[PDB]
Design a binder for these strands. Structure first.
Ligand SMILES: O=c1ccn([C@@H]2O[C@H](COP(=O)(O)O)[C@@H](O)[C@H]2O)c(=O)[nH]1
Ligand SMILES: [Mg+2]
Ligand SMILES: [Mg+2]
Length: 672
RNA sequence: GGUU
């Protein structure tokens, strides 16, 4: 009655290979719950994706499901803003379809709370069916049934969908676990960990058995296999409270007017061996996940913060890259090899910046830092000349304290020139590792590419920029976009450039890890970095891609054996998980950031919090999305509530109200 | 996108 009956695998599976139906995985809009699409590559079709707009078109399918779709007649296709499909695609149309069936899966339980509307609509005896609101907004509300609504009101629950009948406007399901109270820090972190499928259990006894037992020390056997650099002034430069030091650097005068620079990375592969429980776990996690109030390390704590970590005044192993630069800052020598180092100081970015800028400081570390700063400044200019994108992101530091429920302060992270110096040096080391490894193993090198933006990606944003400042963004090359981004300036508002440099990050494709045999040498290109070949080598403590590159670099030099990296399915499955786990760890981090911003705003509960500048960043049929740079929060405001819908990129004054829900507004323009 |  409300939906068309689904088809049986009898005609579903035949139709897909027949071509009468197309098959793909459902991707639902993070903004709109009832708007999806299937991306893929079908036979006899020029298009890369089919839209599934509406509840009737999505036919009860959930995000992630493997749906079978039937194309709507080309007359019903969605344009840019009886015919042939090719005629329609030439006039910029997008294919449209209706979900005709689903492929059974282990569809995850969803974290969330009972929909507050249902709690307000009620004021209990017996069993009652009520609506559950999954935290994931791509998932519709599920109807659950409990005889203890009272004991569940304030709880975070996990719900599994059981079915969605042809006549029900919502699917039915049931709760499988009570995770805790809504608002609880540990429950809200468990929600984030579960929603992003983060493995976060303690390491097994098998994993801890892989660590070195007893008092750890550098051995004479290993020293006779390493370049001993312990007499060199090596330092590390990291954020505050960083116990995991992945890289350290040195710099000195050599051969008259030349400079030697080493980038010394933690020798994780000395402790982490292939085929062990520890490596099996590190491979699965693939990356360390960082939350506001906690972190889920890829490797055990003993390695992370002690034996691998380049700790100051402790002898440590390392896998170093070294270069000799001439007067023109051109490399005259390059060395990859295993070393034994001893960091003189584990510095914080600001301390390094003060040291460089203090005229009274003539210490070996201060001088080395000035040299690395000089050299890095040169690398940044060559990179802007190359066409590298210089984009912006906002990260907040949350001031927590055991005596307060909510964080007492929220400020942006501090940035110094030493932050750019470390970035340049790591970008330099990773690119040297990429080239060196690829010279040895052209058919299975773990690399990192970034495709150029999709077609018409900057259209919407360009309509607004050209309207406001008379400029357009040119994505033909990395260099053109970088030069046109430099011209994106509003003379009456200095934030405009940083805002555009932030919104342009949302128009780019995700960068991906890959085996060098998947594509041609020209497809190795990193659009964002304007580089022909790139990889991650500098963080094996917190990234498994780096572990694989350190392995391949040792086999490239012949100081280790080659592994079966070699098996095609295996090297392409390795990249696949690196990409999945990387994405989930990014969502987990952003989720935790939003969480703590909500907790900070709880300090002004039922109180009046002052109004800050905001910008119109998105415009749907129904809502105006406003970004408040001060808090890094995006508000959703209904067009029905406004005297006039503001234009895209308009700088408005945003009213913020805490009623535990956050309400946004535009100071002027609200209907009374 | 990118660095720690
Ligand atoms: O994705 C990341 C990577 C690193 N860090 C921060 O960077 C610091 C530098 O250490 P590392 O984790 O990069 O080795 C860490 O202490 C941590 O605070 C993050 O917050 N997120
Ligand atoms: Mg580090
Ligand atoms: Mg690191």
């Amino acid at each position: 009655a409300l939906f068309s009956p689904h088809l049986a695998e009898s005609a579903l599976d035949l139709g897909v290979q027949n071509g009468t139906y197309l098959r793909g995985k459902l991707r639902v809009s993070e903004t709109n719950c009832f708007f999806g699409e299937i991306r893929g590559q079908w036979k006899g079709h020029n298009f890369e994706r089919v839209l599934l707009p509406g509840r009737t078109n999505l036919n009860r399918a959930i995000h992630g499901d493997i749906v079978t779709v039937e194309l709507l007649p080309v007359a019903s296709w969605r344009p840019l803003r009886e015919e042939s499909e090719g005629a329609a695609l030439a006039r910029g149309y997008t294919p449209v379809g209706r979900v005709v069936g689903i492929t059974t899966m282990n569809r995850r339980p969803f974290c969330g709370s009972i929909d507050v509307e249902e709690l307000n609509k009620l004021a209990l005896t017996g069993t009652v069916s009520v609506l559950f609101q999954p935290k994931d907004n791509r998932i519709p509300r599920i109807r659950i049934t409990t005889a203890h609504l009272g004991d569940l009101k304030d709880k975070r629950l996990s719900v599994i969908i059981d079915d969605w009948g042809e006549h029900s406007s919502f699917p039915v399901g049931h709760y499988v676990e009570v995770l805790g109270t809504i608002g609880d820090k540990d429950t809200e972190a468990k929600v984030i960990l579960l929603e992003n499928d983060i493995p976060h259990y303690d390491f097994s006894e098998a994993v801890y058995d892989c660590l070195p037992k007893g008092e750890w020390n550098v051995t004479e056997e290993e020293l006779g296999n390493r370049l001993d650099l312990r007499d060199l002034c090596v330092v590390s430069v990291d954020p505050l409270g960083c116990r995991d030091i992945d890289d350290a650097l040195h710099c000195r005068r050599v051969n008259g007017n030349h400079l030697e620079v080493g980038v010394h990375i933690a020798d994780v592969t000395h402790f982490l061996k292939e085929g062990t429980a520890m490596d099996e776990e590190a491979a699965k996690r693939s990356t360390s996940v960082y939350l506001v109030d906690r972190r889920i390390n890829m490797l055990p704590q003993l390695l992370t913060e002690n034996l691998c970590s380049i700790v100051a005044d402790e002898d440590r192993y390392a896998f170093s890259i070294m270069w000799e630069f001439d007067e023109n800052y051109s490399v005259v020598r390059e060395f990859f090899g295993k070393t034994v180092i001893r960091s003189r100081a584990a510095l914080y970015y600001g301390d390094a910046q003060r040291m460089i800028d203090d005229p009274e400081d003539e210490s070996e570390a201060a001088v080395s830092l000035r040299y690395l700063m000089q050299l890095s400044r040169h690398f940044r200019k060559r990179r802007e000349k190359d066409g590298a994108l210089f984009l912006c992101s906002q990260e907040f530091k949350f001031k927590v304290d055991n005596d307060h429920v909510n964080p007492t302060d929220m400020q942006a992270y501090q940035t110094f020139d030493s932050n750019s110096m470390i970035e340049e040096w790591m970008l330099f080391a990773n690119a040297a590792a990429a080239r060196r490894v690829y010279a040895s193993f052209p058919r299975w090198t773990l690399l990192r590419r970034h495709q150029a933006p999709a077609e018409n990606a900057f259209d919407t944003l360009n309509e607004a920029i050209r309207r406001k400042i008379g400029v357009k963004l040119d994505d033909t090359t990395s260099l053109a976009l970088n030069e046109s981004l430099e011209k994106c300036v509003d003379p009456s508002d200095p934030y405009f450039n940083r805002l555009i440099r932030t919104l342009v990050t949302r128009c780019l494709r995700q960068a991906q890890y890959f085996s060098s045999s998947e594509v041609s040498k020209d497809e190795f290109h990193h659009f964002g970095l304007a580089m022909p070949i790139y990889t991650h080598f500098t963080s094996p403590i917190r990234r498994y891609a780096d572990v694989i590159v350190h392995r391949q670099l040792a086999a490239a030099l012949g100081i280790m054996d080659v592994s079966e990296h070699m098996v095609s399915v295996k090297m392409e499955a390795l990249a696949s998980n690196l990409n999945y786990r990387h994405e989930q760890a990014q969502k987990a981090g952003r989720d935790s950031q939003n969480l703590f911003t909500g907790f900070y705003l709880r300090n002004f509960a039922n109180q009046e919090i002052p109004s800050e500048d905001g910008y119109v960043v998105k415009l749907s049929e129904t809502h105006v999305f406003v970004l408040v740079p001060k808090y890094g929060q995006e508000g959703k405001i209904a067009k029905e509530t406004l005297v006039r819908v503001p234009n895209l990129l308009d700088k408005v004054k945003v009213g913020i109200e805490v009623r535990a829900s956050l309400v946004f507004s535009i100071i002027g323009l609200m209907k009374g």
